[PDB]
Design a protein around this ligand. Structure first.
Ligand SMILES: Nc1ncnc2c1ncn2[C@@H]1O[C@H](COP(=O)(O)OP(=O)(O)OP(=O)(O)O)[C@@H](O)[C@H]1O
Ligand SMILES: Nc1ncnc2c1ncn2[C@@H]1O[C@H](COP(=O)(O)OP(=O)(O)O)[C@@H](O)[C@H]1O
Ligand SMILES: [Mg+2]
Ligand SMILES: [Mg+2]
Lengths: 422, 422
């Protein structure tokens, strides 16, 4: 109580003493030093009866509130905390050891929480407010931040921070986790090596980026690969890799470098493969053009819960991408460009699997016909609640991309894998 | 070590001695002479013992770093080096003999690399920086330069210099490489000299542009040729040639001059032939129009793995133009415009082959009918792994374009070559 009252009085005095805009104009170190000096002066003026440690703690709290992330700072610093959920200014939950717990942390009010959320989202050039209540982003340290504004979040601004996991999986791990059978792993190796235009669809948090990172491991080291991303997630191991990242528009609305611009430039950097960190806009069109004009092996990842939905989503993205084209034009462009679709999915038990490996066979009339080389069949459930299933090959001995395999001498391995998991 | 340490010390002394702005004001010759004199004086003062050749090499390197393009200079000098790709200050690949390879060339740091890139772009007036991180330009000597600034390129500024190839393969070379048999070479010469409408399709890296450049050697000197290219690659030897290049939009999205606009104008420039570097968009329509409207002999490369795929790609490209043309109308336009399609493919063993020389016979209901005059048949593969095959004439004695050959007086050569290949 006494500490809280002293902190409130000191904050009010500081607010009445200086304007936050001036400090914001200053650097973090200079602003923090000035805030500490002003807080010490205010404490001396008020003759607050507290220890030097209490004064330092109050100064640190004031500095964090003015420019830091407020009460989240101790939680963000902590490593064991995997997730932080703030359901309004007065409810803060943290995930520790896989269990959600209610912390005593509290914000001053929904306005302070909204300011903190706006700071966090702007840290990556994103803006959240009444006009744009919802904002999802990925911070540079790899944590995912989701924010909803009061207009939608009835009980106050809602914030979710999912902190980055250190480790990253490999195809061997996926085989171990039963995400894909060994024959499926071999077929994926053939698909990646033989320069097949890939689309790695999947639901949110279903392993799209991890699967793409594993797939890139099959690219030949000699190939010049150009990776475009919004958050710099991939960790390709090849020597000749060019890592590009989009630049979101500044607060003035200028300086934007969308993924479409990155892909258009990539067409002029003499790459062999263009790897888009995630297709969500007009770049799809360009990417498909890249797939269909000599940049074979270009891989992208897409948000879709099934290959059919992935194809429909790609068609829509091309449609809204400025250019007005016939639906059949876009459909046959997709058919010509995309060779394989891999459906990463999350099961009802929360586990992750590679449900579909599918070929874009062709276009019949106005319907894109595809064939599933590999499908995951769920056959029940275990005693612990975990889903139970198995990956089975559809038995297609000659997939549409067989020629590509022949071009690289991988046709023998493709046949072996397709036969060994019938 | 000793040489590197001496070079570093000399560079530091020169930086502390001569102002960069003053040297920039001075001309290249005077600046170089002053820099050489200052470096010699500094070496004498430092009492550094080195050979005359070593001292001259160090002075030249220092001058290049101060004024030239630093370690990038020798790579530009070498003729055999086609492309130079710098991914950050520590990695430099060069395309030699058509294969990319890493080089021990390393820049001092990313700041030096960015400075060199800025100087290179400014040489043609363009400027690249954080405000405009992406810069694509054509140097006066014809080399294309693409630069990506650090904010987009995570690993440091990315540079791509595609040098213009001085010498290009001729039809004699293609005959030597067994790409086309001598009878096929004669038939191609007849097709080129007959002002036959042409489309040179092909797969990735299949030599479409090289084949087009070879075929343009048959154009009569007196014809007024007009060339449209996204990137200047063709080198026609005729006297009356007009070379045009598209201008991609700046980052502001302004000033774009698409290849469609270039061909639209070319229809007004009173040409005898229009040579489109590569048809990959709506420009197809305009190109096809040029073929209908008396500009007989127009050529254009296209990405496709077979003549049927080339025709389908042309239809799709025409549909992309926004005109409400039905499919039947587009097929009729293609049949009436295109005369011969040359499909060049790259085989498994890396060999280039002119797989097909096929006419566009006509249009049955909904289906374009083509007849292959010349076909490359693969009989298998030798124990060395190379694909074994031969070029065979289909036996069509009177090609659809026979009348044009008779008009130009080449019909007898055409018949002789077709019979000999038979
Ligand atoms: N096959 C798998 N088996 C087990 N754990 C997995 C698997 N794939 C991913 N994970 C774990 O789940 C996390 C999901 O993050 P990931 O980047 O792979 O997902 P995503 O599909 O890109 O999702 P988002 O929609 O957030 O981009 C991975 O970081 C890893 O921790
Ligand atoms: N018929 C051929 N035989 C041997 N090499 C070839 C042939 N055609 C092209 N090349 C080589 O291939 C390289 C690239 O070919 P390119 O002109 O880019 O074809 P495309 O434009 O279809 O990719 C050239 O540097 C050339 O040396
Ligand atoms: Mg992802
Ligand atoms: Mg070309």
């Amino acid at each position: 109580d006494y500490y809280h009252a002293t902190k409130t009085t000191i904050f009010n005095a500081l607010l009445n003493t200086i304007d936050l805009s001036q400090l914001a104009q200053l650097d973090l170190k200079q602003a923090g030093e000035e805030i500490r000096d002003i807080v010490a002066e205010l404490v001396a003026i008020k003759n607050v009866s507290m220890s030097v440690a209490e004064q330092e703690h109050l100064v640190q709290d004031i500095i964090n509130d003015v420019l830091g992330y407020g009460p989240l700072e101790p939680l963000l610093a902590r490593d064991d905390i995997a997730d932080i959920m703030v359901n309004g200014a007065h409810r803060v939950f943290i995930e520790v050891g896989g269990k959600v717990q209610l912390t005593n942390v509290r914000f001053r009010d929904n306005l302070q929480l909204m300011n903190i959320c706006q700071r966090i989202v702007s840290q990556v050039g994103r803006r959240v407010d009444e006009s744009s209540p919802i904002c999802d982003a990925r911070l540079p340290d790899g944590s995912r931040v989701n924010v909803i504004a009061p207009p939608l979040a009835l009980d106050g601004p809602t914030l979710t921070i999912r902190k980055f996991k250190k480790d990253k999986l490999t195809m061997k791990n996926l085989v171990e986790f039963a995400s894909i059978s060994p024959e499926g792993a071999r077929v994926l190796g053939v698909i990646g090596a033989c320069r097949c235009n890939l689309v790695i669809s999947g639901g949110t948090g279903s392993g799209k980026t991890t699967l793409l990172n594993t797939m890139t491991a099959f690219i030949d080291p000699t190939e010049r690969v150009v990776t475009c991303e919004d958050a710099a997630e991939l960790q390709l191991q090849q020597p000749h890799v060019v890592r590009l990242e989009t630049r979101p528009p500044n607060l003035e609305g200028s300086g934007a470098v969308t993924m479409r611009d990155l892909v258009k430039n990539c067409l002029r950097m003499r790459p062999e493969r263009i790897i888009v960190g995630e297709v969500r806009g007009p770049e799809a069109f360009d990417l498909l053009q890249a797939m269909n004009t000599g940049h074979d092996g270009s891989m992208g990842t897409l948000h879709a819960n099934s290959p059919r939905e992935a194809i429909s989503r790609i068609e829509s993205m091309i449609t809204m991408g400025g250019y007005g084209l016939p639906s059949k034009t876009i459909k046959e462009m997709i058919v010509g460009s995309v060779d394989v679709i891999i459906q990463a999915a999350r099961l009802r038990d929360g586990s992750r699997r590679i449900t579909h490996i599918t070929e874009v066979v062709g276009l019949e009339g106005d319907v894109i016909v595809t064939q599933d080389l590999f499908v995951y069949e769920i056959t029940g459930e275990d005693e612990h609640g975990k889903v139970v299933g198995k990956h089975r090959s559809t038995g297609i001995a000659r997939p549409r991309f067989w020629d590509r395999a022949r071009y690289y001498g991988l046709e023998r391995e493709l046949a072996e894998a397709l036969d060994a998991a019938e």
